[PDB]
Ligand binder design. Structure first.
Ligand SMILES: CC(C)C[C@H](CC(=O)NO)C(=O)N[C@H](C(=O)N[C@@H](C)C(=O)NCCN)C(C)(C)C
Ligand SMILES: [Zn+2]
Length: 255
């Protein structure tokens, strides 16, 4: 019961620093402190087993604010580089490659925490807001909560897929504060072991009259409905199993 907190590495790239933090370290830091805290309220108050398996959440261990782009040599790349990859003409990276790059460059630091999350400000194609590796109760699981090394031929080092990312820009504008909270909650949800909520008899995708959809629905919920900020029964079952298996592994006490 004491090891109930997933310690985070939170990173804000130069884009987030500039457009969301107004180029100020204080504003950027406070934004991300407050957002993670709001997301934590959702997590801590969720009873994963619909009883007393409550009190599990997230807490920032380290915050890194990248104030300027990462100077890069020819043919070389970095998640914090000024240009988007692989298509320099696009407003955004390709989201999958960005998450992959982030994990590679931040490997050393990620091995020290339960999860690493990247906050950026770029307009991913076709309406995408965030992405994350799915966690699992499986011992040899490679993804989600807890740093489970994955050798990387090319970097002579271990890489950890205990990561996810959130962008606060979509369709040419800054998304709402309540929407940003839902994106991170959703991505961290995957890291905690949840898959997407399915439609049908499973009770995991209610109609508007029944409170609306839950946070792990694949199509971004608005946040206007009661169930939008909460986890469905389908997510609870998946996450419950993951937490009970990995909590002793890398979770720590709340600070
Ligand atoms: C926080 C959200 C739920 C994350 C997912 C991506 C995901 O599953 N990451 O774990 C997303 O970006 N969903 C997009 C999404 O629902 N975006 C909305 C804003 C959208 O474009 N709706 C369509 C408007 N005509 C997709 C990829 C489905 C377009
Ligand atoms: Zn998702």
């Amino acid at each position: 019961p004491m090891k109930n907190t997933c310690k985070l590495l939170v990173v804000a790239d130069h884009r987030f620093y500039r457009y969301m933090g107004r180029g100020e370290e204080s504003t950027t830091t406070n934004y991300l402190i407050e957002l993670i805290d709001r997301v934590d309220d959702i997590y801590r108050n969720t009873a994963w087993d619909n009883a007393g398996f409550k009190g599990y959440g997230i807490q920032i261990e380290q915050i890194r604010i990248l104030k300027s782009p990462q100077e890069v040599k020819p043919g070389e790349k970095h998640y914090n580089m000024a240009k988007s990859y692989p298509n320099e003409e696009k407003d955004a990276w390709d989201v999958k490659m960005l998450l992959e790059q982030f994990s590679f460059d931040i490997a050393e630091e990620a091995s020290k925490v339960c999860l690493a999350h990247l906050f950026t400000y770029q307009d991913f194609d076709m309406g995408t807001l965030g992405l994350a590796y799915v966690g699992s109760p499986r011992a040899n699981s490679h993804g989600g909560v807890c740093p489970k090394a994955y050798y990387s031929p090319v970097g002579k080092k271990n890489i950890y897929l205990n990561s996810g990312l959130t962008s606060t820009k979509n369709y040419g504008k800054t998304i709402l504060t309540k929407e940003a909270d839902l994106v991170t909650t959703h991505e961290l949800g995957h890291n905690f072991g949840a898959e997407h909520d399915p439609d049908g008899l499973a009770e995991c995708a209610p109609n508007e009259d029944q409170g609306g959809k839950y946070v792990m629905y694949p199509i971004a919920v608005s946040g206007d409905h009661e169930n939008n900020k909460m986890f469905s029964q389908c997510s609870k079952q998946s996450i419950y199993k993951t937490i009970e298996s990995k909590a002793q592994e890398c979770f720590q006490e709340r600070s």
